[PDB]
Amino acid sequence: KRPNFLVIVADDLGFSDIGTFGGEIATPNLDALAIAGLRLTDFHTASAASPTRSMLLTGTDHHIAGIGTMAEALTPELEGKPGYEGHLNERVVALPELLREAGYQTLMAGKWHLGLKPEQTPHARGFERSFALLPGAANHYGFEPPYDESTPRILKGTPALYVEDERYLDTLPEGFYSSDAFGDKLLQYLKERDQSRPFFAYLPFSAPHWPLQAPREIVEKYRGRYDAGPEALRQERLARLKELGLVEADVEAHPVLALTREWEALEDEERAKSARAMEVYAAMVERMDWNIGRVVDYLRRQGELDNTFVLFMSDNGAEGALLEAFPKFGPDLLDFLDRHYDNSLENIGRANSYVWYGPRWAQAATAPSRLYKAFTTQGGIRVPALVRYPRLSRQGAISHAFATVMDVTPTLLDLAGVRHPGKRWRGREIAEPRGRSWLGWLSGETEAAHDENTVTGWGLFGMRAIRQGDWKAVYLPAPVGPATWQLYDLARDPGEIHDLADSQPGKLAELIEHWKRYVSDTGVVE
């Protein structure tokens, strides 16, 4: 029989957060899947949420699929540019659209971030059943601030805007907490399914994305765990990554860069609030894991899990952003939060708190990689991923084989026996995948789905990367980089520390040719 699919996406989860990826956070359900499956150390997304999601569900690049930049970042200049529509566009066909016409039941519960309008919903784009947060974020409990002209832009852009199928919801249920509600709905849809046909189940959490919020009883489990701070944590993560074989023992970690005060420079009250944010974060991840368990355990008891291809991934690097640092997110975010929320120590994590853990906590989870979410360095794009499917040969191991989010759609089509329709679908021109099916690799026929000549690009927020084999060039503009192409050998320098631009000018030049072709193939506009 054709397999089921369960595609689970964490939101801004960091590389070493989960237990089997070197973390101290309780993730038993994921860990059971991970150790019996295949853990990926060289799996890549885009550097931010909607770009990644557009790639996941198409098998092509975000600049083609409609999210050339984030909608919330769109300009009048970028306006009519193809692929910069700000929603999944009609130049692509989505994975669920293809499966659904081939007899799969398409079921989703979670964050969408691929369009706000009726014709852009999961219902519109291939899901027979869906319960979805349409924006990029929202209050986990559905506590909404006043909305008027004076509301910070980052809050105006993140209302708790939910749909079920075609119905825009006017209320949320009592006791609504995002991760629990997604677990509840997806379980509902699975229990309500036609058991005589396969399913494609999509479970995009909004945890552990800001605002950091979680049940108090889970936050309590972490009381005091993070009192030694983000650098002490980074060292624990690095040690554990090397003990587990996820990173080689000789790997040189990128230095931590931030403009904030280091832990030892903070006052006791400042530390206590920052540590509490990280305790809350941990609980978000544990609670997400618990919901995943509810879904997976149900499938297991049904006798369906072993014929379910289970993919878990984060959508981008850990979130190091200081939301107060960007005037576009304002005006006066901190003041608004001071007047509308309660970020007192004892209230952090509750519905009427609103915190984010910042650059030092984030870089603890991306280490040894350079930087974090919204950068084209490895910190922003290399994400934890696991595949559990016992029909595959490559299970029980850790793989450092190059892989991307664009490989997923072709892999699942392949397993489903469903052909990509080529260049036309429903009477319109569509893009063909840029990724490659993982089947030969995971079936043990080949060592990897890519090779030394594979070329992949990235570009978002003025930053660039271009990679061929294990050679990668990066471009970070001022004030966050040198506004010049830097060149790295990822096989020797996973931390992107040693710029080889001057010593290997021919390799850089080759990569710059690839970058131009990437721009041209995908329609990148800066």
Q: Measured at CB, which residue is nearest to Ca ion?
A: 49
- The nearer residue to Ca ion, 168 or 326, going by C-beta atoms, is 326
CB of 487 to Ca ion, least distance (A): 28
- Which 99-128 positions form the footprint of Ca ion (CB under 5 A)? none
- The nearer residue to Ca ion, 281 or 488, going by C-beta atoms, is 281
CA 466, CA 468: separation in Å to the nearest integer? Answer: 7
- The nearer residue to Ca ion, 180 or 315, going by C-beta atoms, is 315
Rounded alpha-carbon distances, angstroms, from residue 282 to 176, 187, 219, 454:
19, 24, 7, 36
Q: What is the total count of residues that contact Ca ion (CB under 5 A)?
A: 5
- The nearer residue to Ca ion, 51 or 494, going by C-beta atoms, is 51
CB of 12 to Ca ion, least distance (A): 4
- The nearer residue to Ca ion, 374 or 466, going by C-beta atoms, is 374
CB of 72 to Ca ion, least distance (A): 13
CA 180, CA 187: separation in Å to the nearest integer? Answer: 11
Which strand (E) or helix (H) includes residue 378? helix 378-381
Q: Stretches 25-33, 43-51, 165-173, 412-420: which one binds Ca ion (CB under 5 A)?
A: 43-51
Is 11 an interacting residue with respect to Ca ion (CB under 5 A)?
Answer: yes
CA 22, CA 234: separation in Å to the nearest integer? Answer: 11
CB of 50 to Ca ion, least distance (A): 8
The 488-517 contact track toward Ca ion, x by CB under 5 A, reads ------------------------------
- The nearer residue to Ca ion, 49 or 285, going by C-beta atoms, is 49
Is 206 an interacting residue with respect to Ca ion (CB under 5 A)?
Answer: no
The CB-side HSE value for 320 (13 A sphere, CA atoms) comes to 26
Characterize the bridge pairing of strands 428-429 and 38-40. Answer: unpaired
Q: Helical H runs in 228-319?
A: 229-243, 268-301
CA 428, CA 234: separation in Å to the nearest integer? Answer: 49
- The nearer residue to Ca ion, 12 or 180, going by C-beta atoms, is 12
Q: Stretches 60-68, 313-321, 469-477, 490-498: which one binds Ca ion (CB under 5 A)?
A: 313-321
Q: Tell me which of 6, 49, 137, 466 binds Ca ion, using CB under 5 A.
A: 49
Residues 6+ apart with CB under 8 A from 325: none
CB of 318 to Ca ion, least distance (A): 10
Q: Stretches 48-56, 94-102, 434-442, 509-517: which one binds Ca ion (CB under 5 A)?
A: 48-56
Is 12 an interacting residue with respect to Ca ion (CB under 5 A)?
Answer: yes
CB of 209 to Ca ion, least distance (A): 6
- Burial class for 318, CB neighbours closer than 10 Å (0-12, 13-18, 19+): buried
Is 45 an interacting residue with respect to Ca ion (CB under 5 A)?
Answer: no
Report whether 9 contacts 314 (CB < 8 A).
yes
Secondary structure (3-state) at 40? strand
Query: What angle (nearest 5°) sits at the alpha carbon of residue 445, between those of residues 439 and 450?
Result: 65
Q: Stretches 4-12, 214-222, 260-268, 295-303: which one binds Ca ion (CB under 5 A)?
A: 4-12
- The nearer residue to Ca ion, 160 or 401, going by C-beta atoms, is 160
- The nearer residue to Ca ion, 186 or 321, going by C-beta atoms, is 321
The 315-334 contact track toward Ca ion, x by CB under 5 A, reads xx------------------
CA 152, CA 166: separation in Å to the nearest integer? Answer: 29
Residues 6+ apart with CB under 8 A from 490: 378, 467, 470, 471, 472, 496
**DSSP per-residue codes, 320-353:** ---GGG-GGG-SSHHHHHHHH----GGGTTSTT-
Query: What angle (nearest 5°) sits at the alpha carbon of residue 380, between those of residues 133 and 259?
Result: 105
Q: Under the rule (CB under 5 A), what is the footprint of Ca ion?
A: 11-12, 49, 315-316
